[PDB]
Amino acid sequence: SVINTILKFLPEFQWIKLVYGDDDYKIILKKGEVELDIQQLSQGEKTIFTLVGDLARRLILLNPNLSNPLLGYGIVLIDEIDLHLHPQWQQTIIERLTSTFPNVQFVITTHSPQVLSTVSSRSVRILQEVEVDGVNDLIVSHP
Amino acid sequence: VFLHNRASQEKLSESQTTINALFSDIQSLKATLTQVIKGLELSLKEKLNYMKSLQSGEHKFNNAVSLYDSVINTILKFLPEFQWIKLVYGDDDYKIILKKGEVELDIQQLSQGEKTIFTLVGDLARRLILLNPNLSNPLLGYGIVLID
Amino acid sequence: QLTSKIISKFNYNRLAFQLLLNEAPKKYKVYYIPKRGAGFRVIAQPTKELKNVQRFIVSLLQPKLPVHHKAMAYEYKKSIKDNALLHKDNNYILKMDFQNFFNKIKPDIFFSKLENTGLKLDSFDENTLRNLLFWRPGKKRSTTLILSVGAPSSPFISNFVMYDFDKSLDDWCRNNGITYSRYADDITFSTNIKDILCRVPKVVKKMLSLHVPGLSINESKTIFTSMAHNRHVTGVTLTPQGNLSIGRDRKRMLFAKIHKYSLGLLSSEEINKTKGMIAFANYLEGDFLLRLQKKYGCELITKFLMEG
Amino acid sequence: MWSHPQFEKINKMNLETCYVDFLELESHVINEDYLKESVELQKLISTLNESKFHLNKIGIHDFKRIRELQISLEDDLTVFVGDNGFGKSTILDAIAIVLSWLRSNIEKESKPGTYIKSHEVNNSVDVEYASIDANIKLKDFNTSILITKAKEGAYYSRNNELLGVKKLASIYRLVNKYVDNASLPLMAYYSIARSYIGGGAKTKTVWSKFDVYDEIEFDRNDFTDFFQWL
Amino acid sequence: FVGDNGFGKSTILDAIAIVLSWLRSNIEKESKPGTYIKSHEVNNSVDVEYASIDANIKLKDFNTSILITKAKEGAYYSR
RNA sequence: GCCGGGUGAUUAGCCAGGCUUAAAUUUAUUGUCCGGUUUAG
Numbered sequence: 001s002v003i004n005t006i007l008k009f010l011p012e013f014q015w016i017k018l019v020y021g022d023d024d025y026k027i028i029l030k031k032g033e034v035e036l037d038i039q040q041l042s043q044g045e046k047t048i049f050t051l052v053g054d055l056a057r058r059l060i061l062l063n064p065n066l067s068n069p070l071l072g073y074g075i076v077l078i079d080e081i082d083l084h085l086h087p088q089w090q091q092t093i094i095e096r097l098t099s100t101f102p103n104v105q106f107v108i109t110t111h112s113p114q115v116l117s118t119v120s121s122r123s124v125r126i127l128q129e130v131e132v133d134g135v136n137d138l139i140v141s142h143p
Numbered sequence: 144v145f146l147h148n149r150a151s152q153e154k155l156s157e158s159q160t161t162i163n164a165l166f167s168d169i170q171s172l173k174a175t176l177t178q179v180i181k182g183l184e185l186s187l188k189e190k191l192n193y194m195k196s197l198q199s200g201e202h203k204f205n206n207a208v209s210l211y212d213s214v215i216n217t218i219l220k221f222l223p224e225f226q227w228i229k230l231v232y233g234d235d236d237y238k239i240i241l242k243k244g245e246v247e248l249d250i251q252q253l254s255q256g257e258k259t260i261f262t263l264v265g266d267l268a269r270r271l272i273l274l275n276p277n278l279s280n281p282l283l284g285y286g287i288v289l290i291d
Numbered sequence: 292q293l294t295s296k297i298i299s300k301f302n303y304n305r306l307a308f309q310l311l312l313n314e315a316p317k318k319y320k321v322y323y324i325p326k327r328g329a330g331f332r333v334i335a336q337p338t339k340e341l342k343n344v345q346r347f348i349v350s351l352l353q354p355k356l357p358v359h360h361k362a363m364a365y366e367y368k369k370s371i372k373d374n375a376l377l378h379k380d381n382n383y384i385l386k387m388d389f390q391n392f393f394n395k396i397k398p399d400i401f402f403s404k405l406e407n408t409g410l411k412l413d414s415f416d417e418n419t420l421r422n423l424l425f426w427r428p429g430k431k432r433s434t435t436l437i438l439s440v441g442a443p444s445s446p447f448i449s450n451f452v453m454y455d456f457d458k459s460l461d462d463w464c465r466n467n468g469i470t471y472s473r474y475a476d477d478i479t480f481s482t483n484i485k486d487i488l489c490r491v492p493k494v495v496k497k498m499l500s501l502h503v504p505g506l507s508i509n510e511s512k513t514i515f516t517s518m519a520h521n522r523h524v525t526g527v528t529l530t531p532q533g534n535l536s537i538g539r540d541r542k543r544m545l546f547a548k549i550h551k552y553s554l555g556l557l558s559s560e561e562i563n564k565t566k567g568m569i570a571f572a573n574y575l576e577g578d579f580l581l582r583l584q585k586k587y588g589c590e591l592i593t594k595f596l597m598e599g
Numbered sequence: 600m601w602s603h604p605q606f607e608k609i610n611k612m613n614l615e616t617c618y619v620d621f622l623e624l625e626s627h628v629i630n631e632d633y634l635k636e637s638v639e640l641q642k643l644i645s646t647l648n649e650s651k652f653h654l655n656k657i658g659i660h661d662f663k664r665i666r667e668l669q670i671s672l673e674d675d676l677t678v679f680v681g682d683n684g685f686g687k688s689t690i691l692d693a694i695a696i697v698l699s700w701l702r703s704n705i706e707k708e709s710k711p712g713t714y715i716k717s718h719e720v721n722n723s724v725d726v727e728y729a730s731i732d733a734n735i736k737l738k739d740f741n742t743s744i745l746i747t748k749a750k751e752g753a754y755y756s757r758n759n760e761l762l763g764v765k766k767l768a769s770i771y772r773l774v775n776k777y778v779d780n781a782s783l784p785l786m787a788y789y790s791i792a793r794s795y796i797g798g799g800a801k802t803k804t805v806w807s808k809f810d811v812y813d814e815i816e817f818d819r820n821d822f823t824d825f826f827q828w829l
Numbered sequence: 830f831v832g833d834n835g836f837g838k839s840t841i842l843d844a845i846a847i848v849l850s851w852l853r854s855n856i857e858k859e860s861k862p863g864t865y866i867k868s869h870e871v872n873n874s875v876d877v878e879y880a881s882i883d884a885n886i887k888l889k890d891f892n893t894s895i896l897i898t899k900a901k902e903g904a905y906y907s908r
Numbered sequence: 909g910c911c912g913g914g915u916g917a918u919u920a921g922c923c924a925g926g927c928u929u930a931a932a933u934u935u936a937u938u939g940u941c942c943g944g945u946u947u948a949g
C-alpha cells in the first residue's frame with residue numbers, strides 16, 4: 001500500500017525495490033529503461049517523495065486498528081504547494097491529494113493561477129489590501 | 144559597516160592628522176604592551192595599516208559616500224515599495240532599518256520574497272565593487288553569471 | 292468622620308479596634324465550588340465579624356456615590372427582566388465580556404475616583420477604608436490588595452467605579468441608534484441597521500484605556516447573532532415575534548413533572564424543587580399558571596401549591 | 600477534570616455528559632473487569648469515534664502585519680491566494696501556535712507549549728498587546744482557546760485561557776487508558792524549509808505512536824527516520 | 830552485595846548515584862535542577878505506570894527523605 | 909428549493925405524532941454559603 005501510494009504521484013516510474021547492498025541497503029527506482037538511485041533524482045521528484053512518504057508514515061503510525069489507515073482524521077497545513085513543479089503537475093496535485101486522504105482537513109496557500117483553475121468557488125479566499133478610515137488593513141473576499 | 148564608517152569619516156572630515164592619530168594609537172598600544180601577545184601584535188599591525196591607509200588618502204571621485212549611495216540606490220531600484228534604507232547604530236551595534244509605508248522594519252522582519260532579491264542583488268554588487276576599483280563606474284565590469 | 296461612627300456603633304475600644312485594623316485584610320476563607328459541567332471555581336469569603344461591619348460601611352456610603360442608570364446589576368428594583376426588555380424589539384445582537392474584572396480593582400483606582408467626586412476625607416478615614424474593604428492574597432510581603440467577589444462591599448464598589456465608562460459609552464451609542472446595557476462584567480449591544488455592529492469592538496477598546504486603566508477585553512467570548520438563530524439575553528429567550536420566554540425544553544420539563552405528580556410518583560424534595568421553578572416562570576411569563584389550570588384543572592394545582 | 604456529583608440538569612447526549620458520567624462511576628467501582636465492560640464506556644467510545652475533528656474559525660488581533668481579522672475555514676479544503684507581503688504565512692504560523700498547546704497537553708498535562716516571540720508584535724505606536732483565538736468543534740462539542748502577549752515595556756498584565764484544551768485533552772488520555780490501540784488525531788506542518796529537508800547514532804529498535812508527537816513541524820532528522828522505518 | 834543474576838547489581842548503585850546528584854546541585858546553587866529519570870528506564874510491562882526511588886539520610890537525630898518519580902507517556906495522572 | 913432556528917396544541921408525557929411562523933457566512937446557556945430580584949413559612 002505504501003509503495004503504490006508513492007507510485008501514484010510519479011506515473012513515469014515502474015517499480016521501487018529495496019536492494020540489500022553488501023555494505024548497506026539502498027533503494028532502486030526504474031524510469032524508462034534505466035535504473036535510478038534516489039540520490040540521482042531531480043529536485044521536484046524529491047519533494048513529492050518526501051511529502052507523501054512522511055504523510056503515509058504518520059497516518060500508519062497513528063491508526064493501528066483501522067483496516068485502511070489512510071482514512072484517519074486530522075489537520076494538515078501546507079505552504080506554497082507550487083515549489084519546483086512544472087505547470088503540467090500543478091493542475092492535478094490538488095485532486096490527487098484530496099482523493100488519497102479524504103478525511104483530512106487541508107489548509108493550503110498558493111502563488112500561481114494554474115492551481116486556481118481547478119478549485120471550487122466555495123473553497124477560495126482572496127486577501128486584499130484596503131485603506132479604511134485612514135488606516136491600511138487586510139480583508140478577505142469570497143469569489 | 145566598513146564602507147559606511149569610511150564614508151562618514153570622509154563626509155564629516157574633522158580627522159585632522161588621521162595618520163598621525165593612528166600612529167599615536169599604535170605607539171600607545173606598544174607602550175601598554177611594554178608595561179594574547181600575538182593578538183596584541185596583530186592589533187598593532189592593524190593600527191599601522193590604518194595609519195598607512197589614512198596617510199594615503201586617495202579621495203577619488205568614486206569616494207566612499209558615492210559608492211554607498213550607488214549601492215543603496217541600486218538595491219532600492221528593485222524594491223519600489225520601500226522608501227529608504229539606513230544603518231542605525233545603537234546598543235554598541237549596527238542594525239539595518241527599512242521604511243515601508245509608515246512602518247519601520249528590521250532586516251529579519253521582511254518576507255521571503257524581498258529577502259531573496261536583497262541577498263542576490265547585494266552579492267552581485269559587492270563583487271563588482273571589489274573586483275573593479277579603477278573604473279569610474281564600477282558597475283561595468285565583465286563576467287559570467289549562472290542562475291538556476 | 293467615619294471612624295467615630297463605626298466605633299460608637301459597635302462599641303469598640305481603642306486597642307481592639309487597632310488590632311482589628313491590622314488583622315482585617317487576612318480574615319478570609321478560600322474554597323472550591325462545583326461547576327455546571329466539569330471543573331471547579333475558587334471563592335474567597337470573609338468572616339462573620341467582618342461581614343456585618345462591611346455592610347454598615349456600604350450603607351453609609353451608598354447615598355453619596357452616583358451610579359449610572361444603565362447598570363442593571365446589584366441595584367434596587369432591577370433584575371434580569373428589566374435588562375431584557377431593552378433589546379426585545381431589535382434584529383441584530385452582539386455580546387462581549389471582560390477578563391478577570393473583579394481582581395483588577397485596586398485602591399489606587401478607587402481613591403483616584405473618590406478624589407474626583409469632590410468628597411474630602413481625612414487621612415485616618417482613608418487608612419480605615421483601605422484596610423477594611425480589600426483582600427491581601429499570598430504572603431504578608433505581597434503588599435497587593437484586590438477587591439475579589441464574595442464580600443458584601445464589592446458589588447456596590449464596582450458600579451461606582453465604572454460610572455465614567457458607562458456614561459461615555461451611553462451617549463456615543465445613542466447617536467448611532469444602538470441600544471446598550473451592562474450587567475456585572477457583561478456588555479450587550481443591539482440594533483436594526485445592517486453592517487453597523489462591526490465597528491464597536493475598536494470603540495470600546497479605545498474607551499477602556501482612556502477611562503479606566505488596567506482593564507482588558509476577552510476576545511474569545513464575542514458573539515454576533517440575528518433573528519435566524521437562537522437569541523437570549525442573560526438567560527431569557529427572545530422569540531422572533533418579540534416576546535420573552537423561558538424555552539420549549541423547560542416547558543416540557545415542567546409539564547411532565549406535574550403529570551407524574553398527578554399519579555403520585557414524586558418525592559418530597561422534588562415538589563419543593565419544582566415549586567420555585569414554577570414561581571419563577573410565572574414571574575417571567577405572567578400566564579403560565581393559567582395555561583396549567585386550563586389543562587390539569589384548578590383542584591389539582593391548588594392542592595399541589597398548598598402541599599407541604 | 601473533576602469527579603462532581605453529576606448534576607441532573609436536563610436530558611442530553613453531549614460527549615461531556617458521558618465523560619462526567621464515566622468519571623462518577625469510576626470513583627465507586629474498583630474492579631477493573633467490571634469497568635472495562637460498563638455500558639458507559641461503550642457510549643463514550645461510540646461518541647468519540649463518530650465525531651470528526653475539524654477547526655471552525657479563527658481571529659487575529661495586532662499580530663505581525665494583520666491588525667484585525669476573522670476567518671472561517673471549510674471542513675475539507677480551503678485555499679488562500681495573494682501576492683508577496685500579504686501575510687499568507689502569518690495565518691499558518693498562528694494556527695500552528697494554537698495547535699501546539701493541544702499537542703503538548705496530550706503527552707503530559709500542565710506542560711507549556713509555544714509562546715509569542717517578542718519581535719512578532721505589531722510595530723505601531725498605539726499597540727499594547729497581541730492576541731490569537733480559535734475554536735474547535737467536535738460535531739456538537741465546542742472548545743475555544745486564547746493566546747496573548749503584552750508588548751515589552753508595558754506594566755499591565757494579561758493571561759491565557761487554557762481550560763478548554765486541558766479538558767479536551769483529558770478525554771483523549773482517559774480513553775487511551777482503557778483501550779489497547781486507541782487512535783489519535785493527526786497534526787502536521789510543512790513549512791518552506793522542507794526544500795532541503797529532503798534536498799540535503801544508536802540504532803532504533805522500539806517504535807510508538809508518541810514518536811510523531813515530539814514536534815509539530817517537519818525538518819531534518821524526520822527524513823532519516825523514514826528510511827529506518829521503511 | 831553478593832549474588833549473580835540478570836538484573837545487575839550495578840543498577841542499585843546507579844539508583845544511589847541519581848539521588849546524591851540532587852544534593853550536590855542544590856549546594857552549588859539554589860533550586861538548581863539535578864538528574865531526572867529518563868523515559869526508557871521505566872519498565873516495559875503492561876501493568877506499570879511509573880517508576881519511583883525513595884531514599885533517607887540521617888545526621889545524628891535529623892532525618893530527611895527524598896522521593897524521585899517519573900510516569901510513562903500519555904498517563905492519566907502526572908507525578 | 910434546501911438546511912438550521914422560535915413554540916400553542918398533543919400525548920401512562922422530559923422521548924413522538926401533528927399544525928403555524930423566522931432568515932447577510934454569523935449563540936455551542938453560564939457561579940454559592942455573598943449581592944440585589946421572584947415565591948412562600
Ligand SMILES: Nc1ncnc2c1ncn2[C@@H]1O[C@H](COP(=O)(O)OP(=O)(O)OP(=O)(O)O)[C@@H](O)[C@H]1O
Binds near residue numbers: 079664688719720
Ligand atoms: N512587527 C511587524 N510590524 C509590521 N509589519 C510587520 C511586522 N512583522 C512582519 N511584518 C510584515 O510582514 C510582511 C510579511 O508577512 P508574511 O511573511 O506572512 O507574508 P508573505 O509574503 O505572504 O509570506 P510567505 O512569503 O512567507 O509565504 C512584511 O511585508 C512586513 O511588512
